[PDB]
């Protein structure tokens, strides 16, 4: 019931791979209104990434069955498939809204004007989980969560482009997901390519900035930025 | 609500890797009191094995940590681990009692005295989930489920030894889990290895007689019998 134990339960849940328990424990420590340490901050991101990832993976395979079996299949089986897809859809959207609530009410809110690292970390997460919502949305409900993802990504970009080094893994990771957001959600290959290229180039010019602690995390993201750039011609 | 839809729901949940949903669909198909076909029998077996299997891996990870923490005596971190262990423990035992009820009320009940193949399959399954109970039980509650696992395994063994060919994958796999029960649960290594080699020897004496269909299935379980022998000193 104590905060120090709640973080320990989340550590245990990750070892037991019960990410629903892990995300619930971190949801509690976030609700205590005390700021999150760098480690506790990564426990929350890992927990809800696994939870929303399980729903998103299940949603993708069911929706694929729903589309490829939407021509000839019996009217009774397709009514069972689309019913299962929407059940997963509501589960995904409920987890996303759960994350965006912690972000707007506790995490982004309790950030000072000088906490550019945590501000960019939480703002990128906001654009991430709004992007996950845009994958399963259609019509006017899609165009709004798309612009909410854009407002979260764009603000995280300006704070990162000014107050953080180009080799910082948080700044690099943001440019990755932001450029992915442009290519897959907005269908803007020209802008997605530009965003990923400048972030890679600016990190290359200051390659002599990597320390022994942050050399791994930064270099792999640069490779992923290259990998995504080769794919987009 | 229809049986053909319930089984198709279970196939969806398997592809979506939502084994909790899959076990619930096959529980409904079983609760219609109509005997289960071969395909529906394995859909139920696969679903609950994944459901109870995720709890077995989580319990083993947590109970391993509980052992290294009960020697330090932190008196505060140890109690939170035992709580998480017993939370997973109750989830595991609830899944087992759910399967054992389906076995006693529907599956074994609807087996005629001449349905030797199905009688061995379900009885072995009964000894299996009673053994899963024995892995997390203590005191006299353990010696109870150990005795229940023994009666189910032994009766399935006598039926298979009399009415089944030694190369039959059902009979071979029973000897595997029965020998595993002897070594790991009852700590009777003389009989665990006697059982494993007897079943392996008897199955080779007529291994020439089979088709290729009953060759890959038959031999794979035999390799497991060999692996267990080498790994059991």
């Amino acid at each position: 019931v104590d905060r120090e134990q709640l973080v320990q339960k989340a550590r245990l849940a990750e070892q037991a791979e019960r990410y629903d328990d892990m995300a619930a424990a971190m949801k509690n420590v976030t609700e205590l209104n005390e700021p999150l340490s760098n480690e506790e901050r990564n426990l929350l991101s890992v927990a809800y990434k696994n939870v929303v990832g399980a729903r998103r993976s299940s949603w993708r395979v069911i929706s694929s069955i729903e589309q490829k079996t939407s021509a000839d299949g019996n009217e009774k089986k397709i009514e069972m498939v689309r019913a299962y897809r929407e059940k997963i859809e509501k589960e995904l959207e409920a987890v996303c809204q759960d994350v965006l609530s912690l972000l707007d009410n506790y995490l982004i809110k309790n950030c000072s004007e000088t906490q550019y690292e945590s501000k960019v970390f939480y703002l990128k997460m906001k654009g991430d989980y709004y992007r996950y919502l845009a994958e399963v949305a259609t019509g006017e409900k899609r165009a709004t969560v798309v612009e909410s993802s854009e407002k979260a990504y764009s603000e995280a970009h300006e704070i990162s482009k000014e107050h953080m080094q180009p080799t910082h893994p948080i700044r690099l990771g943001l440019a990755l997901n932001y450029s992915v957001f442009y290519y897959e959600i907005q269908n803007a290959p020209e802008q997605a390519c530009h965003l990923a290229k400048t972030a890679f180039d600016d990190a290359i010019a200051e390659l002599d900035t990597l320390n022994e602690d942050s050399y791994k995390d930064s270099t792999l993201i640069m490779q992923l930025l290259r990998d995504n750039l080769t794919l987009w011609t | 609500v229809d049986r053909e839809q319930l089984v198709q729901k279970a196939r969806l949940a398997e592809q979506a890797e939502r084994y909790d949903d899959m076990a619930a669909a096959m529980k409904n198909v079983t609760e219609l009191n109509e005997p289960l076909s071969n395909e529906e029998r394995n859909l139920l077996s696969v679903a609950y094995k994944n459901v109870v299997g995720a709890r077995r891996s989580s319990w083993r990870v947590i109970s391993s940590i509980e052992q290294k923490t009960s020697a330090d005596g932190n008196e505060k971190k140890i109690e939170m681990v035992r709580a998480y262990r017993e939370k997973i423990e109750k989830e595991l035992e609830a899944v087992c009692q759910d399967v054992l009820s389906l076995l006693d009320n529907y599956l074994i009940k609807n087996c005629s005295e001449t349905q030797y193949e199905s009688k061995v399959f379900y009885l072995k399954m009964k000894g299996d989930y009673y053994r899963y109970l024995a892995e997390v039980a203590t005191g006299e509650k353990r010696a109870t489920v150990v005795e229940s696992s023994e009666k189910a395994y032994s009766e399935a063994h006598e039926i298979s030894k009399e009415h089944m060919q030694p190369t039959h994958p059902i009979r071979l796999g029973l000897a595997l889990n029965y020998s595993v029960f002897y070594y790991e649960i009852q700590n009777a290594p003389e009989q665990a290895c006697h059982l494993a080699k007897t079943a392996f020897d008897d199955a080779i004496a007529e291994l020439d007689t089979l088709n290729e269909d009953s060759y890959k299935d038959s031999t794979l379980i035999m390799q497991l019998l060999r692996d267990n022998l080498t790994l059991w000193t």
């Binding site: 550590r11 990750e14 070892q15 791979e17 480690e39 990564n42 426990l43 991101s45 890992v46 990434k49 991430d128 990771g173 990755l176 997901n177 992915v180 290519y183 897959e184 993201i221 992923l224 990998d227 995504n228 794919l231 | 094995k49 299997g53 299996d128 796999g173 595997l176 889990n177 595993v180 790991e184 379980i221 497991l224 267990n228 790994l231």
Partner: peptide, 19 residues
């Protein structure tokens, strides 16, 4: 390469029978 976004797998330390 299917999901082109950023993975951060872990933040800690992440049969004998037939199956």
């Amino acid at each position: 390469d299917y999901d082109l976004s950023l993975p951060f797998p872990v933040c800690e330390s992440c049969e004998h029978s037939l199956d």
